[PDB]
XYZ file of C-alpha atoms in Angstrom:
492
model
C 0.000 0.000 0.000
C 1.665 2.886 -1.428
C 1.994 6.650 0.131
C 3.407 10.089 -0.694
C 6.658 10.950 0.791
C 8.277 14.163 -0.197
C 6.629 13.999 -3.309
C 7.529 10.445 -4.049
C 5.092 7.327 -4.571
C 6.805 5.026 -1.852
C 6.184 1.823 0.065
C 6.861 0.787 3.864
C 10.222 -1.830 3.830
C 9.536 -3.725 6.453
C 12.982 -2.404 7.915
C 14.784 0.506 8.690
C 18.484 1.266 7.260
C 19.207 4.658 8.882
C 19.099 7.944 7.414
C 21.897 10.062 5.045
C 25.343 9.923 6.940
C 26.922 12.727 8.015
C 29.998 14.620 7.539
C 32.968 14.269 4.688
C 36.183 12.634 4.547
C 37.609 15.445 2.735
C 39.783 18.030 4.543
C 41.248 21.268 2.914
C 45.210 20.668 2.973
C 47.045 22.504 5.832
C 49.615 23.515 3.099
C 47.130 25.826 1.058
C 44.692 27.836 3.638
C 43.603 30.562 0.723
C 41.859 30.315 -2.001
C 43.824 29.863 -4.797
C 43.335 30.755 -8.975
C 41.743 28.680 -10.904
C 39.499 26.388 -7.975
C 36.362 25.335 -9.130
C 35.490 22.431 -6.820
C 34.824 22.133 -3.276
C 33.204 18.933 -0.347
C 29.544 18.315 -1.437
C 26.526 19.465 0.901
C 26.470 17.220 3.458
C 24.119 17.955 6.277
C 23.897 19.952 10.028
C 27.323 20.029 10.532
C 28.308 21.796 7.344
C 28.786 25.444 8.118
C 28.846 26.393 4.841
C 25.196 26.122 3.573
C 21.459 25.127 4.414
C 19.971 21.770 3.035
C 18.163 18.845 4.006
C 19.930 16.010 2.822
C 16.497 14.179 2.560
C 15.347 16.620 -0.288
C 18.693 16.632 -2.251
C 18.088 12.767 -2.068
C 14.457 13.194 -2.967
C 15.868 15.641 -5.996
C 18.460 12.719 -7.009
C 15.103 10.081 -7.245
C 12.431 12.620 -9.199
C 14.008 11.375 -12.787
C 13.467 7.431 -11.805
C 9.831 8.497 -10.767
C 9.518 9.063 -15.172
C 9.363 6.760 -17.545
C 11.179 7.512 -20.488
C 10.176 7.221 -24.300
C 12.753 4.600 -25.156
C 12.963 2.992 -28.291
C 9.995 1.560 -31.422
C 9.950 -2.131 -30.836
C 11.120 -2.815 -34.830
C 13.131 -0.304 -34.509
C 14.713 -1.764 -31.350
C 15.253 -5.410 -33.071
C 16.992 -4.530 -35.816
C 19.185 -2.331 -33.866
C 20.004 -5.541 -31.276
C 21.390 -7.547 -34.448
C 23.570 -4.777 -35.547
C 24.700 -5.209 -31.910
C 24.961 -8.659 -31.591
C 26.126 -9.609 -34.808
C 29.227 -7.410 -34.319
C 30.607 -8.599 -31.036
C 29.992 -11.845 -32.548
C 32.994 -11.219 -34.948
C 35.051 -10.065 -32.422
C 34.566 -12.199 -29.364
C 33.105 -15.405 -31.027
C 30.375 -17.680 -30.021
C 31.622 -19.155 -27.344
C 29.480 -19.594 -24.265
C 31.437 -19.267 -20.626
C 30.714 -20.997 -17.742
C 28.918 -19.608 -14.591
C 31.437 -18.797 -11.984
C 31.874 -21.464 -8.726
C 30.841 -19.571 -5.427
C 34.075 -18.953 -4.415
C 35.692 -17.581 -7.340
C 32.490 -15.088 -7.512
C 32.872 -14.537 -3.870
C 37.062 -13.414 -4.555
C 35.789 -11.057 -7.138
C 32.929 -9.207 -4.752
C 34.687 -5.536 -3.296
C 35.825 -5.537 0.200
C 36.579 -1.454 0.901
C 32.900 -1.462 0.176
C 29.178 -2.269 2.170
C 27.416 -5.664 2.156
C 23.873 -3.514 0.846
C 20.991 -2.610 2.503
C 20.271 -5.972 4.043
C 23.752 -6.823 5.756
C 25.521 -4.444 8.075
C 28.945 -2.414 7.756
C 31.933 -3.363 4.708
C 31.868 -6.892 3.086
C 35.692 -6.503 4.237
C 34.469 -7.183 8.048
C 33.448 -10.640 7.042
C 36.447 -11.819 4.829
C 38.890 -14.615 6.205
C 42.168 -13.558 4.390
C 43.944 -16.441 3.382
C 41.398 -19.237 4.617
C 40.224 -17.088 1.349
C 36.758 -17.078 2.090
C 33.925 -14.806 3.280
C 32.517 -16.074 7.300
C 30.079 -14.948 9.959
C 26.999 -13.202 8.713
C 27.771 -12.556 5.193
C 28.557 -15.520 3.861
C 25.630 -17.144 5.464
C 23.706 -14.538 3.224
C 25.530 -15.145 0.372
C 25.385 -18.759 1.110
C 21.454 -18.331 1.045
C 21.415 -16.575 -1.981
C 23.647 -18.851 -4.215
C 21.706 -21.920 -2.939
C 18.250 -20.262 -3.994
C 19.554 -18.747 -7.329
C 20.599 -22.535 -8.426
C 17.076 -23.800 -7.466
C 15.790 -20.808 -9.776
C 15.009 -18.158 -7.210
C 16.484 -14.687 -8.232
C 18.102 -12.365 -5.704
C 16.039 -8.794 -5.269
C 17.284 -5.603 -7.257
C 17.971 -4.008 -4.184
C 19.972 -0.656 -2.640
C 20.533 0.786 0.512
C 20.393 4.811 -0.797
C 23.173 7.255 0.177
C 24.267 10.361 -1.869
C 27.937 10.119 -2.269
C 31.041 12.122 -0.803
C 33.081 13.849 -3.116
C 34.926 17.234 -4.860
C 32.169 18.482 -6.985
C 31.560 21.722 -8.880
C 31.093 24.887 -5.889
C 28.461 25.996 -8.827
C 26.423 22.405 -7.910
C 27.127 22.677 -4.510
C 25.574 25.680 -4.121
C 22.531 24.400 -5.626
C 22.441 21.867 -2.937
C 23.446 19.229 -5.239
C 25.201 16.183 -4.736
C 25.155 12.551 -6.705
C 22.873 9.199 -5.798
C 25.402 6.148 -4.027
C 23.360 3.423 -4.790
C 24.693 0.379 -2.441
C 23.720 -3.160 -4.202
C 22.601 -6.112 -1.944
C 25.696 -8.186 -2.056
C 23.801 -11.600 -2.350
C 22.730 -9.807 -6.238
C 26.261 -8.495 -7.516
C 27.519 -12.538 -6.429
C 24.686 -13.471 -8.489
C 25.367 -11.449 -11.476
C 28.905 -11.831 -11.059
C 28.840 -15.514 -11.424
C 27.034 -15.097 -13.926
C 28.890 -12.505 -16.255
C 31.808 -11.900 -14.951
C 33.548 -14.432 -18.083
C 31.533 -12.447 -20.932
C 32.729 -9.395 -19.407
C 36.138 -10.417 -19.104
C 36.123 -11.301 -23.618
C 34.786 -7.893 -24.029
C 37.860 -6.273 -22.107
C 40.371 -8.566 -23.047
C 39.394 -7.427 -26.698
C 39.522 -3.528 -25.901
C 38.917 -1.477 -27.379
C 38.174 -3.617 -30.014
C 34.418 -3.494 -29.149
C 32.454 -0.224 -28.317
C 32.473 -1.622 -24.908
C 35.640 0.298 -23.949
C 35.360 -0.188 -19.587
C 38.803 -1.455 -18.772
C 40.554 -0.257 -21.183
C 44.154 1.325 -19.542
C 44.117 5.088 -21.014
C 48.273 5.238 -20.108
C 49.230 2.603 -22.469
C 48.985 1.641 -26.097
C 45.296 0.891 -26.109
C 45.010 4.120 -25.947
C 46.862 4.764 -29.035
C 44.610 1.786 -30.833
C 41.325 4.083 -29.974
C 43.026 7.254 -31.423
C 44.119 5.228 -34.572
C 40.796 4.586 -35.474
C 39.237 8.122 -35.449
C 41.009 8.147 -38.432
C 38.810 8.769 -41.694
C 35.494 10.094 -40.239
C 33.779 13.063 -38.584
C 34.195 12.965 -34.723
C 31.781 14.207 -32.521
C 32.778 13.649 -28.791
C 29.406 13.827 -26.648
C 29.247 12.954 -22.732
C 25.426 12.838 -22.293
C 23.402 14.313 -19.007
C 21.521 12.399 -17.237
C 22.564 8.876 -18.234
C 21.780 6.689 -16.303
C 18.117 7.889 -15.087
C 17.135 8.256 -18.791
C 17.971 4.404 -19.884
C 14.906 2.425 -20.678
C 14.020 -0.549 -19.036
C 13.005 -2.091 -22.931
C 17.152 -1.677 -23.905
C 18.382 -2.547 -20.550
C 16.570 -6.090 -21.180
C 17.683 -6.480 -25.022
C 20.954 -5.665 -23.697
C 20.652 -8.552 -20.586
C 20.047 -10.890 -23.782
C 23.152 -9.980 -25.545
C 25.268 -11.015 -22.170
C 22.935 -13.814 -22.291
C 23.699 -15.188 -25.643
C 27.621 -15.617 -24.398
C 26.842 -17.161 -21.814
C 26.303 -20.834 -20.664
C 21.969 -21.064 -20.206
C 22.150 -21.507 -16.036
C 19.680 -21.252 -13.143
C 21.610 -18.246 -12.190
C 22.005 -16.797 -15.314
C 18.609 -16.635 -15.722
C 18.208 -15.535 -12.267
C 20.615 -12.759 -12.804
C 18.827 -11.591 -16.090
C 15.547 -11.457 -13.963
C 17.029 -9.151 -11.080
C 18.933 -6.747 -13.290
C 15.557 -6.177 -15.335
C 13.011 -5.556 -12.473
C 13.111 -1.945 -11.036
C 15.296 -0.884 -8.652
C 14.384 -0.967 -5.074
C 15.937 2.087 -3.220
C 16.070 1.823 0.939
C 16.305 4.826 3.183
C 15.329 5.392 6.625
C 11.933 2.872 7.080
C 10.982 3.306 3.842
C 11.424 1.959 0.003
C 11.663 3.432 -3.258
C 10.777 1.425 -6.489
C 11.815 3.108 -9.930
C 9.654 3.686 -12.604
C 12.719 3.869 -15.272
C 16.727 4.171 -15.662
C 19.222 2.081 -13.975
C 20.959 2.421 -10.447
C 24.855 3.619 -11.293
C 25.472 1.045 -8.283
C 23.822 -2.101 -9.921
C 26.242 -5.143 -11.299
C 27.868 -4.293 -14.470
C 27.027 -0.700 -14.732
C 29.495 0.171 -17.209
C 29.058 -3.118 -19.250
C 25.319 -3.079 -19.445
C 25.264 0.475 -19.675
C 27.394 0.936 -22.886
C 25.921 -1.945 -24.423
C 22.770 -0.226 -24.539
C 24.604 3.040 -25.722
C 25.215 1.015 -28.514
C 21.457 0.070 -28.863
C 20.445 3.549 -29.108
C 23.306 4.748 -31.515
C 22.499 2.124 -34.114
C 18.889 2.921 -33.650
C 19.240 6.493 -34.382
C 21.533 6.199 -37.006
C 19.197 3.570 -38.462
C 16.042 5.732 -38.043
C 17.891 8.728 -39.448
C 18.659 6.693 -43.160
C 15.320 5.072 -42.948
C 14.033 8.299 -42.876
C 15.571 9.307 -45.756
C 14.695 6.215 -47.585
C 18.265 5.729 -48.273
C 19.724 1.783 -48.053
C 22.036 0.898 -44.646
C 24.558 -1.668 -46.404
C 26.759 -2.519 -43.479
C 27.244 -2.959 -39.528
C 26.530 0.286 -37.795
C 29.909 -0.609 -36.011
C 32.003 -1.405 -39.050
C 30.977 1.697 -40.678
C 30.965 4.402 -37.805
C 33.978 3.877 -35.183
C 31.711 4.137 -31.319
C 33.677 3.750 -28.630
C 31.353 4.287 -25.397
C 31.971 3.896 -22.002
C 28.575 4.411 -20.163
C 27.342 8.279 -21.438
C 31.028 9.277 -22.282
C 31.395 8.476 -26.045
C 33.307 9.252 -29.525
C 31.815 8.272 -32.762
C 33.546 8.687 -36.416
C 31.050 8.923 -38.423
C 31.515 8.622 -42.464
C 30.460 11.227 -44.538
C 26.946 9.902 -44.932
C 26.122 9.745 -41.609
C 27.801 13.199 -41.156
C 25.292 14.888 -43.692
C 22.259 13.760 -41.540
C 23.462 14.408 -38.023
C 21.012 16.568 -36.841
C 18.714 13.599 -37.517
C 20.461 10.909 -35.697
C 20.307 13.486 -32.532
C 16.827 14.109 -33.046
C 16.450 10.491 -32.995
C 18.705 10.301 -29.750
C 16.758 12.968 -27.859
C 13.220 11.173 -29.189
C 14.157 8.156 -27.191
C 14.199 10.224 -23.703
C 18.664 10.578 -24.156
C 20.050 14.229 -23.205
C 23.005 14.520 -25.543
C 25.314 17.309 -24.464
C 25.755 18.802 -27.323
C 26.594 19.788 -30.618
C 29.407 20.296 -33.702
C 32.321 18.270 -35.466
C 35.204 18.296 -33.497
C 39.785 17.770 -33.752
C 40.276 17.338 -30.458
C 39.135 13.601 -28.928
C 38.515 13.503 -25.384
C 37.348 10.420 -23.412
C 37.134 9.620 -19.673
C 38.295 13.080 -19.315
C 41.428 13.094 -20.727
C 42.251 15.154 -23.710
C 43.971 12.862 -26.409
C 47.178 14.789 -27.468
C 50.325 15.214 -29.117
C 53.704 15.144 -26.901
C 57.109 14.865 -28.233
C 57.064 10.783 -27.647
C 53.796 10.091 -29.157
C 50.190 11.083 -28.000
C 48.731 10.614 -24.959
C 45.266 10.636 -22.954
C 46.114 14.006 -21.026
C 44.660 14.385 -17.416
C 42.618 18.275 -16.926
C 45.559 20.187 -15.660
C 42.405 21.235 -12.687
C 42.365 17.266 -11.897
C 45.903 17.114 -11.049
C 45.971 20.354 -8.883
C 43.283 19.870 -7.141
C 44.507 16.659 -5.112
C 47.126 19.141 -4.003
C 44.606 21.196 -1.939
C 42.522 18.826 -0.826
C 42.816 16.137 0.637
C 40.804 12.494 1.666
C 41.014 11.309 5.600
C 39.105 11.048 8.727
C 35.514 11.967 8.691
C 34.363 15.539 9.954
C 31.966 18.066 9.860
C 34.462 20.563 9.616
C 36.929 20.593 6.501
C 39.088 23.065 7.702
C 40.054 21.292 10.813
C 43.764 19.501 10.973
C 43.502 15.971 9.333
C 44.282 12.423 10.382
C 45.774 10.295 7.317
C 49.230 8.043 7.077
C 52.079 10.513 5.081
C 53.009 7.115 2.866
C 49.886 6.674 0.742
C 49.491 10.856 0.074
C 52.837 10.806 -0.836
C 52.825 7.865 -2.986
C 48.944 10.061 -4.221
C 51.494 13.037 -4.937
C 54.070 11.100 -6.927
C 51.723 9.811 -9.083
C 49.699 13.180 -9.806
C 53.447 14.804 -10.824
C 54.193 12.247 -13.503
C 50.834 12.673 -14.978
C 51.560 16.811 -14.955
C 54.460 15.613 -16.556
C 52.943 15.076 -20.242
C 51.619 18.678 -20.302
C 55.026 19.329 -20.922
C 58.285 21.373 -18.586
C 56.099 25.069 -18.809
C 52.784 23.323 -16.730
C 55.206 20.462 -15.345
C 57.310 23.124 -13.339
C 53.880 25.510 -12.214
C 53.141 22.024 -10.396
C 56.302 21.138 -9.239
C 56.249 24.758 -7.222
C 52.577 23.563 -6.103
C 54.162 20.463 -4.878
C 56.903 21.289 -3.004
C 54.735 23.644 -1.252
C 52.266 21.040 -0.473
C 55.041 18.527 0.561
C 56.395 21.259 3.293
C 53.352 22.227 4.432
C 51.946 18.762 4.928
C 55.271 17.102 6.060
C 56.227 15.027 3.097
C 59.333 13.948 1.028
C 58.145 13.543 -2.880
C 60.533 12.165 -6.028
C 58.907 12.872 -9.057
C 59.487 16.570 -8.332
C 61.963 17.268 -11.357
C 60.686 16.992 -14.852
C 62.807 13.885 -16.500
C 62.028 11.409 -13.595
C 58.426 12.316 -13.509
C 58.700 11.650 -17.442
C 60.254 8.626 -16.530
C 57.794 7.633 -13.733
C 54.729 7.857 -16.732
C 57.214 6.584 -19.232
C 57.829 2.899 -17.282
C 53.463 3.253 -16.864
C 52.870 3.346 -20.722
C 55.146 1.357 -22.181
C 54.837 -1.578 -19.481
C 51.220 -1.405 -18.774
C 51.984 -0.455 -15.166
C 48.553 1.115 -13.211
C 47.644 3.607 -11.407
């Protein structure tokens, strides 16, 4: 029996899962107590404690949820089909027809995330419960997870469910003034083993592969890969979009065409099937006593976000383009992927279009923003830039550059003991900001020695003011340092 709740159809849970944390783990170093030129971001509201503004955290929730509360347009049903063969039939080339195996429990259980929570259902990180070396999860997790793999196997999906948080992190001073700050959606961990065991092997080809596929999530932007994605701009008309919105605007129609394509490389299983069933039933948000079921998009928490997610950017793209030359009654002769270049990883996406495709743009955007996508926004570009790094040229070859504002940043802030007070002296181990530090100056480093030594100066007045020791602070070993990265595949 369904109620009103800040302007939100809702449902009593049957529990209660506590209300929006409070605080930040973000302090403002005790190097840099000014403002200094060129800061754009700052902590995100984040309740009573913060002195800096007015919100309740309940209502900037409530403002994250309003876009699940619409359905969205989504995409013709014949329409739809012929855009999942374009789809299908192309990874088909690429990965084959193999179908993996379903996990075992254990190696699904290995790949679950420790620094992280168990979901709304089990209490504190999934790291509490882990037996290191006895290499298995114990105590009350792994009886729940235990549960859960013994009913998926008998055919009894796992519920699509979240405990809902709103997430701690830098964000624009423009949104946080706004009283803005992004959905944390916290799976049940009993669903992400589920889905895990049953995808993690299809979504292993697709990265192996990258970026190969469209599908480019994993793909290591310091290393050659890199240099294979800017290769094959090549010979069309970029356009480099990073759409608003995302992933409250996908509709539940792709999102289940898209479950199908996993499906199809993958051994037919009780819990593949089970999986498929979860990740296509509306998401089930838990706050306080109370539960909120969408209407339409997708979680950014759920299993597979980034898989599932640009698998059905890949939907919609051949749709549109489809549409666009249907339209026009003009003939489609080939793969939509074979002749445009996508590369997509969620929202953030480059497409090379050929000449064709480039005369009817305004079309294929039309079609875009018909199925309920924001695009954002508009015009041919030179530059490519993808997971927000500028691709460009250097004097040993080009390179996915990190926003000069990205690297800086980490300089005058930084993460460590929760507070309600930024300002206030932090609490945080000198080896790990250091090591932070080091890395940050050998990514400066490709900007070249005019923006590698403005950082440098930044540095060593971070490292005195914060009582560290740094290496990377002259210009040829930080070049080295992201040298030794690209060449042997070295993360980061």
């Amino acid at each position: 029996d369904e109620f009103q709740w800040k302007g939100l159809p809702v449902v009593k849970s049957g529990l209660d899962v506590g209300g929006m944390p409070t605080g930040t783990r973000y302090h403002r170093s005790p190097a840099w107590p000014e403002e200094q030129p060129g800061e754009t971001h700052a902590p995100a509201p984040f309740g009573s404690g913060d002195k800096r503004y007015t919100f309740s955290q309940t209502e900037m929730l409530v403002n994250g949820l309003k876009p699940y509360t619409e359905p969205t347009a989504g995409v013709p049903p014949q329409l739809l089909s012929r855009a999942v063969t374009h789809v299908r039939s192309y990874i088909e080339t690429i990965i084959g027809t193999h179908r993996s195996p379903v996990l075992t429990y254990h190696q699904a259980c290995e790949l679950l995330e420790r620094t992280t929570s168990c979901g709304p259902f089990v209490q504190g990180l999934k790291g509490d419960y882990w037996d290191e070396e006895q290499q298995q999860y114990t105590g009350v997790l792994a009886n729940h997870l235990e549960q859960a793999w013994d009913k998926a196997n008998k055919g009894i999906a796992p519920r699509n469910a979240y405990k809902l948080a709103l997430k701690d992190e830098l964000r624009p001073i423009e949104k946080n003034k706004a009283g803005k700050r992004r959905l944390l959606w916290g799976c049940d961990a009993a669903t992400t083993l589920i889905a895990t065991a049953a995808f993690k092997a299809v979504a292993t080809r697709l990265q192996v592969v990258t970026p190969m596929t469209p599908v480019a999530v994993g793909i290591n932007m310091d290393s050659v890969q890199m240099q294979v994605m800017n290769d094959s701009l090549k010979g069309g008309v970029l356009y480099c979009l990073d759409y608003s919105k995302w992933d409250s605007t996908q509709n539940p129609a792709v999102t289940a065409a898209s479950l199908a394509i996993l499906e199809r490389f993958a051994e037919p299983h009780p819990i593949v099937s089970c999986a498929i069933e979860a990740l296509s039933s509306p998401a089930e948000g838990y706050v306080n006593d109370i539960k909120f079921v969408t209407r339409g998009g997708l979680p950014s928490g759920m299993p597979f976000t980034s898989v599932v997610n640009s698998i059905n950017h890949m939907i919609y793209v051949a749709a549109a383009i489809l549409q666009a030359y249907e339209s026009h009654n003009v003939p489609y002769t080939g793969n939509v992927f074979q002749v445009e270049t996508i590369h997509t990883y969620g929202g953030d996406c480059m497409y090379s279009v050929c000449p064709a495709t480039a005369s009817i743009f305004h079309t294929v955007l039309a079609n875009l923003t018909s199925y309920g996508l924001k695009p954002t926004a508009i015009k041919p570009t030179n530059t490519p830039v993808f997971l927000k790094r500028t691709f460009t040229q250097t004097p040993h070859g080009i390179r996915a550059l990190l926003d000069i504002t990205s690297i800086t940043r980490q300089f005058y802030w930084l993460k460590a003991n929760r507070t309600s007070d930024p300002s206030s002296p932090p609490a945080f181990d000198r080896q790990a900001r250091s090591a932070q530090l080091e890395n940050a100056l050998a990514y400066a480093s490709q900007h070249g020695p005019v923006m590698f030594d403005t950082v440098r100066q930044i540095a060593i007045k971070t490292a005195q003011g914060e009582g560290l020791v740094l290496v990377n602070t002259n210009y040829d070993q930080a070049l080295a340092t992201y040298n030794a990265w690209f060449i042997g595949g070295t993360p980061d």
